[PDB]
Ligand binder design. Structure first.
Ligand SMILES: [Cl-]
Ligand SMILES: [Cl-]
Ligand SMILES: [Cl-]
Ligand SMILES: [Cl-]
Ligand SMILES: [Cl-]
Ligand SMILES: [Cl-]
Lengths: 184, 184, 186, 186
């Protein structure tokens, strides 16, 4: 009855963090077109995911292209999606003695004021890993865990002696880009 | 009383899959050295992790170097660790109608013999994603999920109509490099 | 004369595997065979993993599985192939002699110097800056230094400073090109 | 004369941040200041993330946090710095004119052609093969094609085939070098 003549996508560009969303909208012309259905597609599916109604979710750093195509006409229009890297900030999750710093997509585990310090940790459903943490050379220790992705669950505790004798901390859970703390 | 004169590490090279282990052993000379303590270290900690007693665990593809250093003497010897990629094989986890193929570190979700097919999935503690799966053009559908790491937990179910009407499958769990299936 | 409308398209082969930098040619078959307008657009859903030419040549870029689609200009009939990009076989390629050189191990190079009192590596990747490193003593007079996470077509200029006993010498500049330079399986 | 034994080492600065391809110079301070043997070995636990020179120049290689250690030849006294390698700021750099060129967006390039009926990109990265692509119609006469996951020092040779209306033309070959080629903030 009333054929589509064209389509547009708004917003025309967008920037999202990994795990963060943005809603795209197809405007079909004319307004009283009989069939206004669109199909949403993405050329860089590693970088961003698109829902059946144009919700775009950032997965990995990069720039990709998200298209609406009309069932009637196969008129196409596109937005450019930029998935940003993690802010280059330091988030402290712990106290004066022990804990971790979120440093983009790495964690820096620390123990301060110890005669020794080990770390026991499991990433998601992977294996338990055990490590002696590295002495900074002044009585404190660091150990980095590398290249965490959004929604990673890290379970960990420490064995250190702070002067009175060896102790285990309790099991703690960190979920990457969910668990919060204090900027450094 | 009896000083160390040297150290060796065996095996001298090793190859491991991601998530897979290998035990290194320091041999201190002479056999009746009074202090036989070693410290284990790794120069490529992204690629492989080393325990306080020389258990080396592959984390990511690459070649790194793992060293034993004697408390007495600081005599050092090294092994070369190669962390291999995933076998280039196809593991089917599903039936005739629906499921996934493990294809190295990607999953290929499939539905066969449907008038439409969507996928709903969550990776570890990340967000739910929803997607229309792509038509192969003969009545079947595929959708890849990209760049899974060892111990990743993927929870998923399908909405498809195979001819009688739309239905959801039950929630299923896949754990990357744990869940098994049949080679293609 | 009469406009003959397209009714279908199929793509062959319907699956393919390639390594990074390697190509596989897809062919869109439009139906019927006397259709006026035979044109197709090729697209890919995972462009980090694989690139498609306007004529359906698929090149592997990164490890993964993606989907390449041909769409008819007439009627927008679509058919798809699944493209898997494999990693490098689990083999070791020696590029050098029994004193110095490198091993290709998947996407990492192991540089080596046999029989010395020290060994240093001087190397630049593509148009990056020169890196200088002390190579790691194996503990037996031998040295090794890994260069990590090379891509196909990466150019590596290298040379060694090392002392086999008499005195310290610089080797000549050498060029390695990742997945082009050949050598002997170990 | 008398052998003066080393008693300690400290490293300064104790933390540093650098971008990929950028350097920071560490300095090992041996104690006491009249120690006979002042030599230190530098090592790093995360060599994919950062490289250390035999004289403690740290270069960023990949995003991450790692630990760089100085060890005294006399007594094996150790002190460490934490090195963070940052990603590229979240900015857009234009390399071209108002008709064609590319945008640097972090480690991806967005190639663009404004005002045409088709647009194709012809490009090679370092010593890889030539890729040919149809650029994606925005839907308004404009085209864009992303090149993904470039490293510092990557050399990109490109040119465009496109038709602004009169007829199809090839642009001249141009060279882009990732994190060396400059342009104007958008
Ligand atoms: Cl893309
Ligand atoms: Cl290493
Ligand atoms: Cl992709
Ligand atoms: Cl895909
Ligand atoms: Cl590393
Ligand atoms: Cl590290």
């Amino acid at each position: 009855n009333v054929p589509v003549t064209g389509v547009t996508v708004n917003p025309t560009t967008a920037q999202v963090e990994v795990g963060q969303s943005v809603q795209l909208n197809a405007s079909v012309a004319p307004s009283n077109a009989t069939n206004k259905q669109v199909t949403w597609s993405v050329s860089g599916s590693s970088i961003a995911s698109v829902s059946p109604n144009g919700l775009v979710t950032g997965l990995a750093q990069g720039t990709t292209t998200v298209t609406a195509t009309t069932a009637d006409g196969n008129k196409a229009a596109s937005a450019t999606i930029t998935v940003a890297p993690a802010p280059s900030t330091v988030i402290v999750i712990g106290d004066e003695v022990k804990g971790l710093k979120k440093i983009g997509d790495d964690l820096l585990f620390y123990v301060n004021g110890a005669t020794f310090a080990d770390l026991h940790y499991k990433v998601n459903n992977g294996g338990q890993l055990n490590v002696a943490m590295a002495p900074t050379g002044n009585g404190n220790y660091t150990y980095p865990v590398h290249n965490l992705k959004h929604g990673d669950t890290v379970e960990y505790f420490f064995t250190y002696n702070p002067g009175q004798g060896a102790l285990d901390t309790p099991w703690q859970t960190y979920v990457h880009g969910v668990t919060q703390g204090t900027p450094e």
